[PDB]
Design an enzyme around this catalytic site. Structure first.
Site, mmCIF file in Angstrom:
data_model
loop_
_atom_site.group_PDB
_atom_site.id
_atom_site.type_symbol
_atom_site.label_atom_id
_atom_site.label_comp_id
_atom_site.label_asym_id
_atom_site.label_seq_id
_atom_site.Cartn_x
_atom_site.Cartn_y
_atom_site.Cartn_z
ATOM 1 N N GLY A 48 52.811 27.997 24.679
ATOM 2 C CA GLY A 48 54.043 28.763 24.678
ATOM 3 C C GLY A 48 55.246 27.876 24.432
ATOM 4 C CG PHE A 50 58.490 26.783 28.904
ATOM 5 C CD1 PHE A 50 58.164 28.111 29.118
ATOM 6 C CD2 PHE A 50 59.821 26.440 28.736
ATOM 7 C CE1 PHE A 50 59.146 29.078 29.170
ATOM 8 C CE2 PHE A 50 60.810 27.402 28.786
ATOM 9 C CZ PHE A 50 60.473 28.724 29.004
ATOM 10 N N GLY A 51 54.870 24.595 27.165
ATOM 11 C CA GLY A 51 53.708 23.730 27.247
ATOM 12 C C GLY A 51 52.439 24.402 26.778
ATOM 13 C CE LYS A 52 48.355 20.320 24.532
ATOM 14 N NZ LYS A 52 47.998 19.713 23.221
ATOM 15 C CE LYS A 73 49.972 25.590 34.763
ATOM 16 N NZ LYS A 73 50.364 26.865 35.415
ATOM 17 C CG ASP A 169 53.916 37.744 35.625
ATOM 18 O OD1 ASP A 169 53.797 38.961 35.368
ATOM 19 O OD2 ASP A 169 53.998 36.872 34.734
ATOM 20 N NE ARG A 173 51.720 39.562 31.783
ATOM 21 C CZ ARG A 173 52.248 40.724 32.158
ATOM 22 N NH1 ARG A 173 51.680 41.868 31.803
ATOM 23 N NH2 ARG A 173 53.360 40.744 32.882
ATOM 24 C CG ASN A 174 49.474 36.348 35.094
ATOM 25 O OD1 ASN A 174 49.276 35.443 34.282
ATOM 26 N ND2 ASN A 174 50.673 36.866 35.306
ATOM 27 C CG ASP A 187 52.196 32.373 36.854
ATOM 28 O OD1 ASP A 187 52.201 32.223 35.613
ATOM 29 O OD2 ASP A 187 53.191 32.771 37.492
#
Ligand SMILES: N#Cc1c[nH]c(C(=O)Nc2ccc(C3CCNCC3)cc2C2=CCCCC2)n1
Length: 304
Positions: A48, A50-52, A73, A169, A173-174, A187
Site C-alpha cells: 500500500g 506506507f509499506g508491504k 510487515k 476496523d 477483510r481483516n 489488522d
C-alpha cells in the site's frame, strides 16, 4: 495520508478488565528480538501507500528451534519519522496483548541493524472475504462452517475486549483463515491498497464508514461496544457470502441519515433467523443495549 495504527488500548472504569499501563509508552521488550538475516523473503503478500507484507521462512524462531512460514510487515524505505513511530506502536501493543488462538499473533521482531520488521503468523488459506466469495452457490462451504467462523471471530474479539483493546476496523477483510480453517482477526492495512479502496472514505483519514457505529461516525467515540456494531456488519458479510455492506448505496449525506434513523440491512439469504437476531442486537442505536462479545460467544455456542 497518515499511517495509521487502528488498534488502541483504552481506559477502563467498569468491566472485568483494568488498564494499568499504556504499552506504546514503554517497551520495546527485547525478548521478541529475532536475528535479521535468519529471515529469507519470498513473495509479496500485499502492499500500500506506507509499506508491504511479505511471506518468508524463519529459521529457528521460537523456543523449539523450528522453521516455519511467517508474514513480515515493513515500511517503504522512504517512510518518514512519524510512520516508523506508528509501526513501533503497533509492535508494542501486539506484545502487550499476548497470544490467542483467534488473533494473528506476534512471533518476533527485527529492530536493530536496519529497518524495523514485524514478524506475525502466516495463515495459509488467506483472508476470509476472498474465501467466502469463492464458495458461493450458483447465482465446499456449509452452514456449520459459517457458524464456526462467526464463533471464532467473536472469541478473538472477546479476547481483545478483555484487554481493553479496541480494534476499530472489524471486517471480513481483516480476518484470516489458517490451518484447519480457523479464523484469526488482525489488522492488515499495510498489505492493502487503501488509497484506492472505495470502502475507506476520506475524512480527517480513511475510515471504513460502512462498518462503523453511529457514535463513531458522528461523535468520533470508540469503545468495545462500537466494535460490536462492526462485528454485526461482519456477520452480515459472512452470511451473505461476501457482499459489500449496504449494496448499491453510496456513502453520502443520505447514508448518514439512514443509519442515524435506525436503518438496518435486511436478513442475508444464507443467515438463519437467530443469527440475524445477533446482527440486529449488534446494531442497537444505544451502545449499552448491544451485547458484549462474550454474550455473543455463549449464544453462538447455545445455537450449536
Ligand atoms: N499484515 C499482515 C499479515 C499477517 N499475516 C498475513 C498473512 O498470513 N497473509 C496471507 C497469507 C497467505 C495468503 C495465501 C497466499 C496465496 N494462496 C492463497 C492464500 C494470503 C495472505 C493475505 C495477505 C494480505 C491480506 C489478505 C490475505 N498477513
Amino acid at each position: 495520508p497518515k499511517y495509521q495504527v487502528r488498534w488502541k488500548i483504552i481506559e477502563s472504569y467498569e468491566g472485568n478488565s483494568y488498564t494499568f499501563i499504556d504499552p506504546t509508552q514503554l517497551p520495546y521488550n527485547e525478548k521478541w528480538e529475532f536475528p535479521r538475516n535468519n529471515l529469507q523473503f519470498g513473495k509479496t503478500l500485499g502492499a500500500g501507500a506506507f509499506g508491504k507484507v511479505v511471506e518468508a521462512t524463519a529459521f529457528g524462531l521460537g523456543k523449539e528451534d523450528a522453521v516455519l512460514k511467517v508474514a513480515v510487515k515493513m515500511l517503504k524505505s522512504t517512510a518518514h519519522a512519524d510512520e516508523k513511530e506508528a509501526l513501533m506502536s503497533e509492535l508494542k501493543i501486539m506484545s502487550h496483548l499476548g497470544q490467542h488462538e483467534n488473533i494473528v499473533n506476534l512471533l518476533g521482531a527485527c529492530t536493530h541493524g536496519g529497518p524495523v520488521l514485524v514478524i506475525t503468523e502466516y495463515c495459509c488459506y488467506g483472508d476470509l472475504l476472498n474465501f467466502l466469495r469463492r464458495k458461493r452457490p450458483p447465482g465446499q462451504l456449509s452452514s456449520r462452517d459459517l457458524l464456526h467462523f462467526s464463533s471464532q471471530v467473536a472469541q478473538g474479539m472477546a479476547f481483545l475486549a478483555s484487554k481493553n483493546c479496541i480494534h476499530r476496523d472489524v471486517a471480513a477483510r481483516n480476518v484470516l483463515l489458517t490451518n484447519g480453517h480457523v479464523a484469526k482477526i488482525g489488522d492488515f492495512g499495510l498489505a492493502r491498497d487503501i488509497m484506492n479502496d472505495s470502502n475507506y472514505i476520506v475524512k480527517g483519514a480513511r475510515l471504513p464508514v460502512k462498518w462503523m457505529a453511529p457514535e463513531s461516525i458522528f461523535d468520533c467515540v470508540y469503545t468495545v461496544q462500537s466494535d460490536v456494531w462492526s462485528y454485526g456488519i461482519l456477520l452480515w458479510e459472512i452470511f451473505s457470502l461476501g457482499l459489500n455492506p449496504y449494496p448499491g448505496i453510496l456513502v453520502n449525506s443520505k447514508f448518514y441519515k439512514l443509519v442515524k434513523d435506525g436503518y438496518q440491512m435486511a436478513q442475508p439469504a444464507f443467515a438463519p433467523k437467530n443469527i440475524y437476531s445477533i446482527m440486529q442486537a449488534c446494531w442497537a442505536l444505544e451502545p449499552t443495549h448491544r451485547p458484549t462479545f462474550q454474550q455473543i460467544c455463549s449464544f453462538l455456542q447455545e445455537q450449536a
